[PDB]
Amino acid sequence: QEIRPMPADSAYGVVHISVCNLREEGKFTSGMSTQALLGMPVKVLQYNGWYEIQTPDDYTGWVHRMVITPMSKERYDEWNRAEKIVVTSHYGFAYEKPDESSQPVSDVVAGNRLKWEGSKGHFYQVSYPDGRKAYLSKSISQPEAGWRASLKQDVESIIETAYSMMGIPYLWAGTSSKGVDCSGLVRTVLFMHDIIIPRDASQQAYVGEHIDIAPDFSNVKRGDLVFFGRKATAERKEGISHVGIYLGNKQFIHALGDVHVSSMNPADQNYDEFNTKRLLFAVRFLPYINKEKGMNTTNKNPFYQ
Amino acid sequence: DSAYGVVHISVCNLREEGKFTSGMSTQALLGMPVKVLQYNGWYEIQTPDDYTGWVHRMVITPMSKERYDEWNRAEKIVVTSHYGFAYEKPDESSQPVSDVVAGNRLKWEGSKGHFYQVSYPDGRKAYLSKSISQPEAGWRASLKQDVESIIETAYSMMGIPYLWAGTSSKGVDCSGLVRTVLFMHDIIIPRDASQQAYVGEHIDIAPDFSNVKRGDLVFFGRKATAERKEGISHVGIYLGNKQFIHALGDVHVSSMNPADQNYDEFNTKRLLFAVRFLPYINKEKGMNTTNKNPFYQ
Ligand SMILES: [Cl-]
Ligand SMILES: [Cl-]
């Protein structure tokens, strides 16, 4: 077909697999551009055999027909209003029975959110956007209201979550615990703390407070983002090629090959000469969550309300 | 310079060309031996299924032939659960070293508590819980390579996402589901559906499906014409009673019986034939087990 825009009964959707793969065009032979998660609300923009969708970070891309559940605004609103079970562990499964030896229904990853239906033993009974029923261990998940109540969004808590992803593979366009790109590591960590910021490194580079890094690095702080790339010239604007999370003491955690810690101190064993020489600036963003457009929490984000 | 290597991340992503903006073509696993064909900033590699593609320089450990051979001779710890992590200490609350997926193999160095001490190709040291892994000798001494066990493994992947070129427990494509399942049973077959279609024994499906058996592959696509050869588009694993398990959106079970609620009309209409392959492991170039495959020997 070529349906654009979508009819009202199919203008909205919810992702119903653990991690779905958005591509630049509606075909497998197009590059992946981002990913969305189980239970995540989306807008459905058009259909040509694949759906073009918009995720809550305003990013757009294309997914196969079978991986989202399209729906009316009314049904989308019902999904969003139901208290969720929030997956907090990186990896696990949901099961047919309250027993991890039973038939799985699907994998889950951190940030996956399913409708809470009940509880049985050491499990939450849950349902998927498509109507599947399952059980999730209380050891890898928890009810959304209590999750929010206990949620920490300080820099140290955020860095701990980044450290929990040590060695996970780099994957281009990767935006989940399964695999991450440079900007996707940032997003995957933040989403585990209920925070959404822009998807691409080139957009993350212009959020919050710009920090012109001092020669001694004294004005860059743990929790800032550090950006790398091609410096602006008279004839050409700057190009952002890479991002990491600053750790203090010239160290930073990032996704390149895998998630790892590097240094900008030439004396350190983990010195990353290539990126250090391409260092551009830092950004301090955490103070401005819900204070500028494009940076928000899911309790405030308009896709969720 | 380097002609050999070993993958040192859980799952690496091979692409058509040496750049991120080229399509993924297959994936390889932690501890898997590879041949290194060239370097242009990225490495062109060949995986043990004889498939080639490109990976970022940081994701494999290039080695001399002697070091490659030593890696291969080292007894491994084999990861048997779909997902987990290896840790800095024998404690799942300690700092992780990396994620792991089923089929990952690391060098066995010892044990502490209920954990194997392991090492990576690049030299990292870690601990893997005995609850998600098994020593290679014991793995081989308990190996299941029958149809029923292979189907059980496929069922254990229910609902996992479809991922184009996906070849691990994280996400699989149609042919990748077949490969991912089979590697958990020590079996390697060709990577692409268009090659899988011509292995083993070709089954010309009877109208009652009576000559198709559990564990056969079913192939879907475009029928040959007078002017044009057949095109293989899709593959699934036959479960009997006209059902098959496959990766399309996610891993799920479909039927070729129009009466069934899980009838898949699109694919049923495109059914071409089935293939009985399991009897022919180690009997044709490109189908083998890792104890016979020359990459490992
Ligand atoms: Cl990649
Ligand atoms: Cl995909």
Coordinates of C-alpha atoms and ligand atoms in Angstrom, one line a residue:
Chain A
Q1 CA 0.0 0.0 0.0
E2 CA 0.8 3.7 0.5
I3 CA -1.3 5.0 3.4
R4 CA -0.4 8.5 4.6
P5 CA -1.4 9.8 7.0
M6 CA -2.8 6.9 8.9
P7 CA -6.5 6.6 9.6
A8 CA -7.5 7.6 13.2
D9 CA -7.9 3.9 14.1
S10 CA -4.2 3.2 13.3
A11 CA -2.5 6.6 14.1
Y12 CA -1.0 5.4 17.3
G13 CA 0.9 2.3 18.4
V14 CA 2.8 0.3 21.0
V15 CA 5.9 -1.8 20.5
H16 CA 5.1 -5.4 21.4
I17 CA 8.6 -7.1 21.1
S18 CA 11.5 -6.6 23.5
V19 CA 13.5 -4.4 21.1
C20 CA 12.3 -3.3 17.7
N21 CA 14.6 -2.1 14.9
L22 CA 13.8 1.2 13.2
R23 CA 15.4 1.6 9.7
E24 CA 16.0 4.6 7.4
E25 CA 13.5 3.2 4.9
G26 CA 10.8 0.4 5.0
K27 CA 13.1 -2.4 4.0
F28 CA 15.6 -4.7 5.7
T29 CA 18.4 -3.6 3.3
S30 CA 18.2 0.0 4.7
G31 CA 20.4 1.0 7.7
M32 CA 19.1 0.7 11.2
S33 CA 18.7 4.2 12.7
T34 CA 17.4 3.6 16.2
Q35 CA 15.5 1.1 18.4
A36 CA 12.4 1.1 20.6
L37 CA 11.3 -1.1 23.5
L38 CA 8.5 -3.4 24.5
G39 CA 5.5 -1.3 25.9
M40 CA 6.8 2.0 24.4
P41 CA 4.2 4.3 22.9
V42 CA 4.7 5.5 19.4
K43 CA 3.0 7.6 16.7
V44 CA 2.3 5.8 13.4
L45 CA 2.9 8.2 10.5
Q46 CA 2.4 6.1 7.4
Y47 CA 2.3 2.6 5.9
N48 CA 3.8 1.2 2.7
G49 CA 4.1 -2.4 3.7
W50 CA 6.2 -1.3 6.7
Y51 CA 5.1 1.4 9.3
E52 CA 6.9 4.7 9.6
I53 CA 6.8 5.5 13.3
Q54 CA 7.9 8.3 15.7
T55 CA 9.3 7.4 19.1
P56 CA 8.9 9.6 22.3
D57 CA 12.3 11.3 21.6
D58 CA 10.7 12.6 18.3
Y59 CA 12.9 10.4 16.2
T60 CA 11.4 8.7 13.2
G61 CA 12.0 5.5 11.3
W62 CA 10.5 2.4 9.8
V63 CA 9.5 -1.0 11.3
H64 CA 8.1 -4.2 9.9
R65 CA 4.3 -4.5 10.1
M66 CA 4.4 -7.3 12.6
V67 CA 6.3 -5.7 15.5
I68 CA 3.9 -2.9 16.7
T69 CA 0.3 -3.0 17.6
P70 CA -1.5 -0.1 15.9
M71 CA -4.5 1.4 17.7
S72 CA -6.8 4.3 18.2
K73 CA -5.9 7.3 20.5
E74 CA -8.4 5.8 22.9
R75 CA -6.7 2.5 23.1
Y76 CA -3.3 4.1 23.2
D77 CA -4.4 6.2 26.2
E78 CA -5.7 3.1 28.0
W79 CA -2.3 1.4 27.5
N80 CA -0.5 4.5 28.8
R81 CA -2.7 4.9 31.9
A82 CA -2.4 1.2 33.1
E83 CA 0.3 0.8 35.8
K84 CA 3.2 -1.1 34.3
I85 CA 5.6 -3.7 35.5
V86 CA 9.0 -2.1 34.6
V87 CA 11.9 -4.4 33.7
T88 CA 15.0 -3.3 35.7
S89 CA 17.5 -6.1 35.0
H90 CA 19.3 -6.0 31.6
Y91 CA 18.1 -9.4 30.4
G92 CA 15.5 -12.0 31.2
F93 CA 12.3 -13.7 30.0
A94 CA 8.6 -13.5 30.6
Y95 CA 7.0 -17.0 31.0
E96 CA 3.7 -18.8 30.4
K97 CA 3.5 -19.8 34.0
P98 CA 4.9 -18.3 37.3
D99 CA 8.0 -20.6 36.9
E100 CA 11.2 -19.8 35.0
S101 CA 11.3 -23.4 33.8
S102 CA 8.0 -23.0 31.9
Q103 CA 7.6 -22.1 28.2
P104 CA 8.9 -18.5 27.6
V105 CA 6.6 -16.0 25.9
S106 CA 9.5 -13.6 25.0
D107 CA 12.8 -12.2 26.1
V108 CA 12.7 -8.9 28.0
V109 CA 15.3 -6.2 28.5
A110 CA 15.7 -3.3 30.9
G111 CA 13.2 -0.5 30.1
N112 CA 10.6 -2.9 28.8
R113 CA 7.2 -2.1 30.4
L114 CA 4.2 -4.4 30.4
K115 CA 0.7 -4.0 31.8
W116 CA 0.4 -5.2 35.4
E117 CA -2.5 -7.7 35.7
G118 CA -1.8 -9.4 39.1
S119 CA 0.8 -11.3 41.1
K120 CA 1.4 -15.0 41.9
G121 CA 4.2 -16.2 44.1
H122 CA 7.5 -14.5 43.2
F123 CA 6.0 -13.3 39.9
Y124 CA 4.0 -10.5 38.4
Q125 CA 1.2 -11.4 36.0
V126 CA 1.5 -9.1 33.0
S127 CA 0.0 -8.5 29.5
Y128 CA 1.5 -7.3 26.2
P129 CA 0.1 -4.6 23.9
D130 CA -1.0 -7.4 21.5
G131 CA -2.9 -9.4 24.3
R132 CA -0.3 -12.0 25.2
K133 CA -0.3 -13.0 28.9
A134 CA 2.8 -13.8 30.9
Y135 CA 4.7 -13.8 34.2
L136 CA 7.8 -11.9 35.1
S137 CA 10.0 -12.6 38.1
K138 CA 9.9 -10.0 40.9
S139 CA 13.7 -10.3 40.8
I140 CA 14.1 -8.6 37.4
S141 CA 11.2 -6.2 37.6
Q142 CA 8.9 -4.0 39.7
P143 CA 5.7 -2.1 39.7
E144 CA 5.9 1.3 38.1
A145 CA 4.5 3.4 41.0
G146 CA 7.0 2.0 43.5
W147 CA 9.8 2.1 40.9
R148 CA 9.3 5.9 40.4
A149 CA 9.0 6.4 44.2
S150 CA 12.5 4.9 44.7
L151 CA 14.1 6.1 41.5
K152 CA 17.5 7.9 41.8
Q153 CA 18.5 10.3 39.1
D154 CA 21.8 11.7 40.6
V155 CA 25.0 11.4 38.6
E156 CA 26.5 8.6 40.7
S157 CA 23.4 6.4 40.3
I158 CA 23.5 7.1 36.5
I159 CA 27.2 6.2 36.3
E160 CA 26.6 3.0 38.2
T161 CA 24.1 2.0 35.6
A162 CA 26.7 2.8 32.9
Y163 CA 29.2 0.6 34.7
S164 CA 26.7 -2.2 34.8
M165 CA 26.9 -2.3 31.0
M166 CA 30.7 -2.9 30.9
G167 CA 31.8 -4.9 27.9
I168 CA 28.4 -5.0 26.2
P169 CA 28.9 -4.9 22.4
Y170 CA 28.8 -1.8 20.2
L171 CA 26.0 -2.0 17.7
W172 CA 25.3 0.7 15.2
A173 CA 21.9 2.3 16.1
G174 CA 21.8 0.1 19.1
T175 CA 19.4 1.5 21.8
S176 CA 19.0 -1.3 24.4
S177 CA 20.9 -3.5 26.8
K178 CA 21.5 -5.9 23.9
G179 CA 24.0 -3.6 22.2
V180 CA 24.5 0.1 22.0
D181 CA 26.1 2.8 19.8
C182 CA 27.8 5.9 21.3
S183 CA 24.7 8.0 21.7
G184 CA 22.6 4.8 22.3
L185 CA 24.7 3.9 25.4
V186 CA 23.7 7.4 26.8
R187 CA 20.0 6.8 26.0
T188 CA 19.9 3.2 27.3
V189 CA 21.5 4.2 30.6
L190 CA 19.2 7.3 30.9
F191 CA 16.0 5.3 30.1
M192 CA 16.8 3.0 33.0
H193 CA 16.4 6.2 35.1
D194 CA 13.2 7.3 33.3
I195 CA 15.0 10.0 31.2
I196 CA 14.7 10.7 27.5
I197 CA 17.0 13.1 25.6
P198 CA 17.6 13.4 21.8
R199 CA 18.8 10.2 20.0
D200 CA 21.7 11.3 17.8
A201 CA 25.1 12.4 19.0
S202 CA 24.7 15.6 16.8
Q203 CA 21.6 16.5 18.7
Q204 CA 22.8 15.5 22.2
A205 CA 25.8 17.9 21.5
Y206 CA 23.5 21.0 21.7
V207 CA 21.3 20.2 24.8
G208 CA 21.8 21.7 28.2
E209 CA 24.8 23.8 29.1
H210 CA 27.8 24.0 26.8
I211 CA 31.1 23.6 28.5
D212 CA 34.3 25.0 26.9
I213 CA 36.8 22.6 28.5
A214 CA 39.7 24.3 30.3
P215 CA 43.2 23.1 29.5
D216 CA 43.4 21.6 33.0
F217 CA 39.9 20.0 32.6
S218 CA 38.9 21.7 35.9
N219 CA 35.6 22.9 34.7
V220 CA 34.3 19.5 33.3
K221 CA 32.6 17.4 35.8
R222 CA 31.6 13.8 36.3
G223 CA 28.2 13.2 34.6
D224 CA 28.8 15.7 31.8
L225 CA 28.8 14.4 28.3
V226 CA 32.1 14.8 26.3
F227 CA 31.9 15.2 22.5
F228 CA 34.4 14.4 19.8
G229 CA 34.7 15.1 16.1
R230 CA 35.8 17.6 13.5
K231 CA 36.3 21.2 14.7
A232 CA 34.5 24.0 12.9
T233 CA 36.5 26.0 10.3
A234 CA 35.5 29.1 8.3
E235 CA 34.6 26.9 5.3
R236 CA 32.8 24.1 7.3
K237 CA 30.7 23.7 10.4
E238 CA 31.8 21.3 13.2
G239 CA 30.9 17.6 12.8
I240 CA 30.0 15.6 15.9
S241 CA 31.3 12.0 15.5
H242 CA 31.3 10.5 19.0
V243 CA 30.1 11.0 22.6
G244 CA 30.9 9.5 26.0
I245 CA 30.0 10.1 29.7
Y246 CA 32.6 12.0 31.6
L247 CA 33.9 10.2 34.8
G248 CA 36.2 12.8 36.3
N249 CA 40.0 12.7 36.2
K250 CA 40.1 12.7 32.4
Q251 CA 38.3 9.4 32.2
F252 CA 35.1 8.6 30.2
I253 CA 32.9 5.7 29.5
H254 CA 31.7 5.1 26.0
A255 CA 30.6 2.6 23.3
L256 CA 33.2 1.9 20.6
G257 CA 33.7 -1.8 19.8
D258 CA 32.2 -2.4 23.2
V259 CA 31.3 -0.4 26.3
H260 CA 34.6 0.5 27.9
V261 CA 36.5 3.2 30.0
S262 CA 39.1 5.3 28.3
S263 CA 41.4 8.2 29.4
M264 CA 42.4 11.5 27.9
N265 CA 45.6 11.5 30.0
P266 CA 48.5 10.4 27.8
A267 CA 50.1 8.8 30.9
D268 CA 47.2 6.4 31.5
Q269 CA 47.2 2.8 30.2
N270 CA 43.7 3.3 28.8
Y271 CA 44.6 6.5 26.9
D272 CA 42.5 7.0 23.8
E273 CA 44.8 9.1 21.6
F274 CA 42.4 9.2 18.6
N275 CA 39.4 10.6 20.4
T276 CA 41.4 12.7 22.8
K277 CA 42.9 14.6 19.8
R278 CA 39.4 15.1 18.5
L279 CA 37.9 16.4 21.7
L280 CA 35.5 19.3 21.1
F281 CA 33.6 20.2 24.3
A282 CA 31.4 18.9 27.1
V283 CA 27.7 19.4 27.9
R284 CA 26.2 19.5 31.4
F285 CA 22.6 18.2 30.8
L286 CA 21.3 16.5 34.0
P287 CA 20.2 19.8 35.7
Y288 CA 17.9 20.6 32.7
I289 CA 15.8 17.4 32.5
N290 CA 12.2 18.6 32.1
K291 CA 13.5 22.2 31.8
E292 CA 14.1 22.3 28.0
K293 CA 12.3 20.8 25.1
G294 CA 13.7 17.5 24.1
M295 CA 14.8 16.4 27.6
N296 CA 12.2 14.9 29.8
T297 CA 11.0 12.0 32.0
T298 CA 8.3 9.6 30.9
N299 CA 5.8 10.9 33.5
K300 CA 6.0 14.3 31.7
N301 CA 6.6 13.3 28.1
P302 CA 3.5 13.9 25.9
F303 CA 3.7 10.5 24.1
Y304 CA 3.0 8.9 27.6
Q305 CA 0.2 11.3 28.7
Chain B
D1 CA 49.9 -8.9 8.5
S2 CA 47.7 -11.0 10.8
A3 CA 45.8 -13.9 9.1
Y4 CA 44.0 -15.3 12.1
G5 CA 41.9 -14.0 15.0
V6 CA 39.4 -14.7 17.7
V7 CA 36.2 -12.7 18.5
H8 CA 36.4 -11.1 22.0
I9 CA 32.9 -9.6 22.5
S10 CA 29.7 -11.6 23.1
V11 CA 28.3 -10.9 19.6
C12 CA 30.1 -9.1 16.8
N13 CA 28.5 -7.6 13.7
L14 CA 29.8 -8.5 10.3
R15 CA 28.9 -6.0 7.5
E16 CA 28.9 -6.0 3.7
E17 CA 31.7 -3.4 3.6
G18 CA 34.1 -1.9 6.1
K19 CA 31.8 0.8 7.5
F20 CA 28.9 1.2 9.9
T21 CA 26.7 2.5 7.1
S22 CA 26.7 -0.8 5.2
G23 CA 24.3 -3.6 5.9
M24 CA 24.8 -6.2 8.6
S25 CA 25.3 -9.6 6.9
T26 CA 25.9 -12.1 9.8
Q27 CA 27.2 -12.2 13.4
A28 CA 30.0 -14.1 15.2
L29 CA 30.4 -15.1 18.9
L30 CA 32.8 -14.6 21.7
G31 CA 35.7 -17.1 21.4
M32 CA 34.9 -18.1 17.8
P33 CA 37.9 -18.5 15.6
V34 CA 38.1 -16.5 12.4
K35 CA 40.4 -16.0 9.4
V36 CA 41.5 -12.4 8.8
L37 CA 41.5 -11.7 5.1
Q38 CA 42.5 -8.0 4.9
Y39 CA 42.6 -4.7 6.8
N40 CA 41.6 -1.2 5.6
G41 CA 40.7 0.3 9.0
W42 CA 38.2 -2.5 9.4
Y43 CA 39.0 -6.2 9.2
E44 CA 37.6 -8.5 6.5
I45 CA 37.0 -11.9 8.2
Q46 CA 35.8 -15.4 7.4
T47 CA 33.7 -17.2 10.0
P48 CA 33.8 -21.0 10.4
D49 CA 30.8 -21.4 8.2
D50 CA 32.9 -19.9 5.4
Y51 CA 30.9 -16.7 5.3
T52 CA 32.8 -13.4 4.9
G53 CA 32.2 -9.9 6.1
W54 CA 33.7 -6.9 7.8
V55 CA 34.2 -5.9 11.5
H56 CA 35.5 -2.9 13.3
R57 CA 39.2 -3.3 14.3
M58 CA 38.5 -3.3 18.0
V59 CA 36.2 -6.4 18.2
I60 CA 38.6 -9.2 17.3
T61 CA 42.0 -10.2 18.7
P62 CA 44.4 -10.9 15.8
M63 CA 46.8 -13.7 16.4
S64 CA 49.7 -15.7 14.9
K65 CA 48.8 -19.1 13.7
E66 CA 50.5 -20.6 16.7
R67 CA 48.5 -18.4 19.2
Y68 CA 45.3 -19.2 17.3
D69 CA 46.0 -22.9 17.5
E70 CA 46.7 -22.5 21.3
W71 CA 43.4 -20.7 21.7
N72 CA 41.6 -23.6 19.9
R73 CA 43.4 -26.3 21.9
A74 CA 42.5 -24.7 25.2
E75 CA 39.6 -26.4 27.0
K76 CA 36.7 -24.0 27.1
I77 CA 33.8 -23.1 29.3
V78 CA 30.8 -23.1 27.0
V79 CA 27.9 -20.7 27.7
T80 CA 24.7 -22.7 27.7
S81 CA 22.0 -20.2 28.9
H82 CA 20.8 -17.6 26.4
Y83 CA 21.9 -14.6 28.4
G84 CA 24.1 -13.6 31.3
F85 CA 27.3 -11.8 32.3
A86 CA 30.8 -12.7 33.3
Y87 CA 32.1 -10.9 36.4
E88 CA 35.3 -9.6 38.0
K89 CA 34.7 -11.7 41.1
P90 CA 32.9 -15.0 41.7
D91 CA 29.7 -13.0 42.7
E92 CA 26.9 -11.8 40.4
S93 CA 26.8 -8.5 42.4
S94 CA 30.4 -7.7 41.5
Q95 CA 31.5 -5.5 38.5
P96 CA 30.7 -7.1 35.2
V97 CA 33.3 -7.8 32.5
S98 CA 30.9 -8.4 29.7
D99 CA 27.6 -9.9 28.8
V100 CA 27.6 -13.4 27.4
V101 CA 25.2 -15.3 25.2
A102 CA 24.7 -19.0 24.5
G103 CA 27.5 -20.4 22.2
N104 CA 30.1 -18.0 23.6
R105 CA 33.2 -20.0 24.6
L106 CA 36.0 -18.7 26.9
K107 CA 39.3 -20.3 28.1
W108 CA 38.8 -22.3 31.3
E109 CA 41.3 -21.2 33.9
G110 CA 39.9 -22.8 37.2
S111 CA 37.1 -22.3 39.6
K112 CA 36.0 -20.4 42.7
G113 CA 32.8 -20.9 44.6
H114 CA 30.0 -21.9 42.1
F115 CA 31.8 -20.1 39.2
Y116 CA 34.4 -21.0 36.5
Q117 CA 37.3 -18.8 36.3
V118 CA 37.7 -17.9 32.6
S119 CA 39.8 -15.7 30.3
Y120 CA 39.0 -13.8 27.1
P121 CA 41.0 -13.9 23.8
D122 CA 42.2 -10.3 24.6
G123 CA 43.5 -11.4 28.1
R124 CA 40.6 -10.2 30.3
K125 CA 39.9 -12.5 33.3
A126 CA 36.4 -13.1 34.7
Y127 CA 34.1 -15.5 36.5
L128 CA 31.1 -17.3 34.9
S129 CA 28.4 -18.9 37.1
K130 CA 28.2 -22.6 36.8
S131 CA 24.4 -22.0 36.4
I132 CA 24.8 -20.6 32.9
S133 CA 27.8 -22.5 31.5
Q134 CA 29.6 -25.9 31.4
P135 CA 33.1 -27.2 30.7
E136 CA 33.6 -28.2 27.1
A137 CA 34.5 -31.8 27.9
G138 CA 31.2 -32.2 30.0
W139 CA 29.2 -30.3 27.4
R140 CA 30.4 -32.7 24.7
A141 CA 29.8 -35.7 27.0
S142 CA 26.1 -34.5 27.5
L143 CA 25.6 -33.2 23.9
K144 CA 22.1 -33.6 22.4
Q145 CA 22.0 -33.5 18.5
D146 CA 18.7 -35.1 17.8
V147 CA 15.7 -33.4 16.2
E148 CA 13.6 -33.3 19.4
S149 CA 16.3 -31.4 21.4
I150 CA 16.9 -29.0 18.5
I151 CA 13.1 -28.2 18.4
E152 CA 13.2 -27.7 22.2
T153 CA 16.0 -25.2 21.8
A154 CA 13.9 -23.4 19.1
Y155 CA 10.9 -23.2 21.4
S156 CA 13.2 -21.7 24.1
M157 CA 13.6 -18.7 21.8
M158 CA 9.9 -18.0 21.5
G159 CA 9.2 -14.3 21.1
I160 CA 12.8 -13.2 20.6
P161 CA 13.0 -10.4 18.1
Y162 CA 13.6 -10.7 14.5
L163 CA 16.8 -8.9 13.5
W164 CA 18.2 -8.8 9.9
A165 CA 21.5 -10.7 9.9
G166 CA 20.9 -11.7 13.6
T167 CA 22.8 -14.8 14.5
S168 CA 22.6 -15.0 18.3
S169 CA 20.2 -15.4 21.2
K170 CA 19.8 -11.5 21.2
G171 CA 17.9 -11.5 17.8
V172 CA 17.7 -13.6 14.7
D173 CA 16.7 -13.6 11.1
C174 CA 15.0 -16.6 9.4
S175 CA 18.3 -18.4 8.5
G176 CA 19.9 -17.0 11.6
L177 CA 17.3 -18.7 13.9
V178 CA 18.3 -22.0 12.3
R179 CA 22.0 -21.2 12.8
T180 CA 21.6 -19.9 16.4
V181 CA 19.7 -23.0 17.5
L182 CA 22.1 -25.3 15.7
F183 CA 25.3 -23.8 17.3
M184 CA 23.9 -24.5 20.7
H185 CA 24.0 -28.2 19.5
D186 CA 27.6 -27.8 18.1
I187 CA 26.4 -27.7 14.5
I188 CA 27.3 -25.3 11.7
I189 CA 25.5 -25.1 8.3
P190 CA 25.6 -22.5 5.5
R191 CA 24.6 -19.0 6.7
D192 CA 22.1 -17.9 3.9
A193 CA 18.7 -19.4 3.2
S194 CA 19.7 -19.7 -0.5
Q195 CA 22.5 -22.1 0.4
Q196 CA 20.6 -23.9 3.2
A197 CA 18.0 -24.8 0.6
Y198 CA 20.4 -27.2 -1.3
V199 CA 22.0 -29.1 1.5
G200 CA 21.0 -32.7 2.6
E201 CA 18.0 -34.4 1.0
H202 CA 15.4 -32.4 -1.0
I203 CA 11.9 -33.3 0.1
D204 CA 9.2 -32.9 -2.6
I205 CA 6.3 -32.3 -0.2
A206 CA 3.3 -34.6 -0.6
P207 CA -0.1 -33.1 -0.4
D208 CA -0.7 -34.6 3.0
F209 CA 2.8 -33.5 4.2
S210 CA 3.3 -37.2 5.2
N211 CA 6.9 -37.3 3.8
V212 CA 7.9 -34.2 5.8
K213 CA 9.4 -34.9 9.3
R214 CA 10.0 -32.9 12.4
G215 CA 13.4 -31.2 12.1
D216 CA 13.3 -30.8 8.3
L217 CA 13.7 -27.2 7.1
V218 CA 10.8 -25.7 5.1
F219 CA 11.6 -23.2 2.4
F220 CA 9.4 -20.5 0.9
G221 CA 9.9 -18.2 -2.1
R222 CA 9.4 -17.7 -5.8
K223 CA 8.9 -20.7 -8.0
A224 CA 11.2 -21.3 -10.9
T225 CA 9.9 -20.3 -14.3
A226 CA 10.9 -21.4 -17.9
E227 CA 13.1 -18.3 -17.9
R228 CA 14.2 -18.0 -14.3
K229 CA 15.6 -20.1 -11.4
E230 CA 13.7 -20.3 -8.1
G231 CA 14.3 -17.7 -5.4
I232 CA 14.6 -18.7 -1.8
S233 CA 13.0 -16.0 0.4
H234 CA 12.3 -17.6 3.8
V235 CA 13.0 -20.7 5.9
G236 CA 11.5 -22.3 9.0
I237 CA 11.9 -25.5 11.0
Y238 CA 9.2 -28.1 10.6
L239 CA 7.4 -29.2 13.7
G240 CA 4.9 -31.8 12.3
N241 CA 1.2 -31.5 11.8
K242 CA 1.8 -28.8 9.2
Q243 CA 3.3 -26.4 11.8
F244 CA 6.6 -24.6 11.6
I245 CA 8.7 -22.3 13.8
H246 CA 10.4 -19.3 12.2
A247 CA 11.7 -15.8 12.7
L248 CA 9.5 -13.1 11.1
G249 CA 8.8 -10.0 13.4
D250 CA 9.7 -12.4 16.2
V251 CA 10.2 -16.1 16.7
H252 CA 6.8 -17.7 16.6
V253 CA 4.9 -20.8 15.5
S254 CA 2.7 -20.8 12.3
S255 CA 0.6 -23.4 10.4
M256 CA 0.2 -24.3 6.8
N257 CA -3.3 -25.8 7.5
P258 CA -5.9 -23.2 6.6
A259 CA -8.2 -24.4 9.4
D260 CA -5.6 -23.6 12.1
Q261 CA -5.9 -20.2 14.0
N262 CA -2.1 -19.7 13.4
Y263 CA -2.4 -20.3 9.7
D264 CA 0.2 -18.2 7.8
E265 CA -1.4 -17.7 4.3
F266 CA 1.3 -15.5 2.8
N267 CA 4.1 -18.0 3.5
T268 CA 1.9 -21.1 2.9
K269 CA 1.1 -19.9 -0.6
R270 CA 4.9 -19.5 -1.3
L271 CA 5.9 -22.9 0.0
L272 CA 8.5 -24.5 -2.2
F273 CA 9.9 -27.7 -0.6
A274 CA 11.5 -29.2 2.5
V275 CA 15.1 -30.3 3.3
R276 CA 16.2 -33.1 5.6
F277 CA 19.7 -32.0 6.7
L278 CA 20.5 -33.5 10.1
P279 CA 21.6 -36.9 8.8
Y280 CA 24.2 -35.2 6.7
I281 CA 26.2 -33.1 9.2
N282 CA 29.9 -33.8 8.6
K283 CA 29.0 -35.4 5.2
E284 CA 29.1 -32.3 3.0
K285 CA 31.4 -29.3 2.7
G286 CA 29.9 -26.5 4.8
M287 CA 27.9 -28.7 7.2
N288 CA 29.9 -29.8 10.3
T289 CA 30.4 -29.8 14.0
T290 CA 33.0 -27.8 15.8
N291 CA 35.0 -30.9 16.7
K292 CA 35.5 -31.5 13.0
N293 CA 35.5 -28.0 11.5
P294 CA 39.0 -27.1 10.3
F295 CA 38.8 -23.5 11.8
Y296 CA 38.8 -25.2 15.2
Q297 CA 41.5 -27.8 14.5
Ligands
CL1 CL 28.1 -2.4 14.5
CL2 CL 15.2 -6.0 11.5

